[PDB]
Amino acid sequence: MSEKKQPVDEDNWDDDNVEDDFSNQLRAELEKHGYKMETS
Amino acid sequence: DVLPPEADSSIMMLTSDQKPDVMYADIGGMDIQKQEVREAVELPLTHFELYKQIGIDPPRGVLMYGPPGCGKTMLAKAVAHHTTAAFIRVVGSEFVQKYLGEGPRMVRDVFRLAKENAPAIIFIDEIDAIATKRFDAQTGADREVQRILLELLNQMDGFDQNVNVKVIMATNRADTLDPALLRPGRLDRKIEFPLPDRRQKRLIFSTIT
Amino acid sequence: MDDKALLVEVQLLESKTYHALSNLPKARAALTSARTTANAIYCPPKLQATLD
Amino acid sequence: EVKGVCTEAGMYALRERRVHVTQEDFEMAVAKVMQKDSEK
Amino acid sequence: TPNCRVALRNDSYTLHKILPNKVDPLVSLMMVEKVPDSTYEMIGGLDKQIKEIKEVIELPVKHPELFEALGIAQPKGVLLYGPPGTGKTLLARAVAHHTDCTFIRVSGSELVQKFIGEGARMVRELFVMAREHAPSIIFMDE
Amino acid sequence: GGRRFSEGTSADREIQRTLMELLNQMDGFDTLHRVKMIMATNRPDTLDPAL
Amino acid sequence: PKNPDLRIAQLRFLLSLPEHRGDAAVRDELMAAVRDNNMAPYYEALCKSLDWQIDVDLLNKMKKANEDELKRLDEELEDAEKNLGESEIRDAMMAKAEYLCRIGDKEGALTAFRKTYDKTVALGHRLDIVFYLLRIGLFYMDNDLITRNTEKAKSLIEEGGDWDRRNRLKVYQGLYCVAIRDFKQAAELFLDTVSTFTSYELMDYKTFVTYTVYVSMIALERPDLREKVIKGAEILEVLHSLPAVRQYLFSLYECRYSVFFQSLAVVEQEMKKDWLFAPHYRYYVREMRIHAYSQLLESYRSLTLGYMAEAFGVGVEFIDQELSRFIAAGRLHCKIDKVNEIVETNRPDSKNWQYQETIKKGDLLLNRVQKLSRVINM
Amino acid sequence: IISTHLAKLYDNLLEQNLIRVIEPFSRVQIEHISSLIKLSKADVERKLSQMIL
Ligand SMILES: Nc1ncnc2c1ncn2[C@@H]1O[C@H](COP(=O)(O)OP(=O)(O)OP(=O)(O)O)[C@@H](O)[C@H]1O
Ligand SMILES: Nc1ncnc2c1ncn2[C@@H]1O[C@H](COP(=O)(O)OP(=O)(O)O)[C@@H](O)[C@H]1O
Ligand SMILES: [Mg+2]
């Protein structure tokens, strides 16, 4: 059984949806606000 | 066929011509025991989640005693008037039936009616008619009563802390009793009714006059 | 000394003066000492309500 | 009488409708159970 | 088995079947008495008394040969004494609970009487149930 | 009537039950009205104080 | 001995994951590691650490003393069974198999603990063994073994009240429910903060206070915040010792929105540093932002966007890309206008969003019994 | 002790008559509620904002 020939060769999901919207959007917000205190 | 439950020992204190007109104010000078039995019976009947939440093991049955004419029947009359729960009021020397079996079935159907009916209250008076000390297995008039005590001694153990069924028992002489009835898990709270003092006494003079 | 009943009066007077002079937790402490003292007297006939 | 106190201390927090037993309920109880020691 | 319930047909009284196992006269007895079952974990500061009672009760079951190493007879009687409210009942219950013996107190009551005998003119009729639950301990009050 | 006992013979048991049934039947849980009891003895010493 | 044992694993985190931070953690981790007989748990922490070439005698002296404790257990068992107490072999290793639990790995713990579980006929030792299994399953994050002894614990919480074994347990359900992202259960297990105690694992009670406020500020709405955490004296006096956190809570409740970002980057930054939070700090403040947007924005309908920069927190285009990514994220119920420079809101009925989660769970369980229906019958 | 609780009682009764007069309508101008309470406008606007918060 399961011969299956070879043509080719939580803990994880809510963090993955945070990666879905938020994969790489500013990462470390710590000084952008203080860079907008003088511009804004 | 299965049956809806039945008992004849008592119905349920029919609630119209049944509540003896007796106010709490009719009893003067019993501030310890009135508030104390208020803690004992109906306060776990209402505020059950405090006894469960702090978890202080509310009493199953209560015993009350003393010299005669200290308001033993009277306090049960007033509590029976001001209760909201159902109330079962039996006369404690009627389980001695002529036929066998009518006694023990007469025991168990009362607690079946208290079980099925409501979070209710059992009252029993003259327990000295049943709970004696000595026995004699040569009459049948004694063996019957022996079985009567063994029934309710089984049945009080047949509870689970979840049913709100309280047993109030009042006698005259605590001496002629088996302490096997007074074991914990069955009886814990004991209330003597001491003779009126000169302080509570005046109050009774004020209320009666 | 021998007395118990006058201690209820002076502790209850402390319960007057610490809240009247705005020291709330010490007033709760002295009030508590008035409770656990006043439990042991057979006759507080008016000092009961005075504490109440 | 130790258990006579410690069982009783819940009645004070219950009669003031607490849900947590406080230390002053215990000394409120010792003055009752030892008053019963003072009784005869 | 002797002292067992049965089913029974009625027309010829032919023996039909064998129901449950009824109940041992001692289990009913302790069910009536209802000793407050206990353990070592609810003992308050009685450890030297625990070390005493282990020597008299605990040892001559687990090691009966150990007294034959010393040629002395095993003890049989224990007297406990002190004021009431001092853990006598929970101690004697607890030791039997941990050594696994049938804790049987006698009270001389008469509700107990029907499970001992019809009259039981002695006290000695208890010994049938005692040696029937042979690793057992007999308890008494004042 | 009787006083009470510390439970001597087997006969006095149910007579005390009869007596306590009478006691509860007098003034337990009843407007005992229009019904008057008249009693008599040669010695009022062998009686229950509850009676 | 597992009572100081959590700081060890927290410092394994602090050694491993902040890659710049690799000096004092391998100092004090060594300080506790090559003393008190710790032998097994640092070979791959030594792989993450340096060579530490001469560890060999340091190993041999400590497995030597471990051999001494092992062989005196082996001196204990035969006199233990010789004149017998309460099976004094397992009465010995019900104290010293926890020594073997710290010192040896989880196996010499577990077979001795499931071993010794059948000895103590009262729960007063059983449930403590279960607490030990809870703690080591917390260490190796044995997420299935915790599900066992949680319920197996709770089965022994009935008989008796045992509120030093129930309220104590609620701390463990709270720490696991904050290990996972279960916040509304986590503050609910962090309800009491009264019967909670000067514990071994949060030796600062105030660290527990910071944890329950950090989870509670998401987990409950204003009605509760305006009764529970604002009027609790026992919760108030311990944040009275906190300058930042008392400001951090009251900036939100007192509608101080601009400094709320300033304290927010502090709390989020420390949460980024924090062990057992560090899995979900990126989930935390993205909820805090949209929650703060909900609190201010659900007051008005015709609030402009150019009010929020100076009044709320600076950066107009940041508010633009932020808000959008949230209307685009299907929450934050409003509809922003652009070329007249105003933000307009709506109110949604609880009929479409309440429908949405039902089609989520319905399609999920349909996938579930669909899959198991494929599993059975081949 | 009376002077202690008059402020919180004033807040309670302020909100009681406050929700009394907000009742009968669908929408209104805040000048009419400031006049009908006979009170200012900024305090009423902030306090109603606290109500909807
Ligand atoms: N406040 C009071 N306290 C005590 N007794 C009172 C009070 N008011 C009236 N009584 C009188 O006391 C009697 C109490 O009746 P009750 O039947 O309860 O007595 P008892 O204690 O049950 O005695 P017994 O068991 O012999 O009947 C009443 O007949 C009544 O006349
Ligand atoms: N050392 C103790 N630890 C816990 N409870 C005790 C202790 N000593 C006495 N008690 C309490 O005393 C009661 C038992 O009294 P005991 O001495 O066993 O019987 P008696 O008082 O009839 O001799 C129990 O309710 C128990 O809780
Ligand atoms: Mg009466």
Automatic annotation (TrEMBL), chain F:
ATP 5 binds at N42. It is found in: Cytoplasm; Nucleus. ATP 4 binds at N42. ATP 1 binds at N42. ATP 3 binds at N42. ATP 2 binds at N42. Belongs to the AAA ATPase family. This is 26S proteasome regulatory subunit 10B. The chain holds residues 253 to 303 of 403 of the full protein.
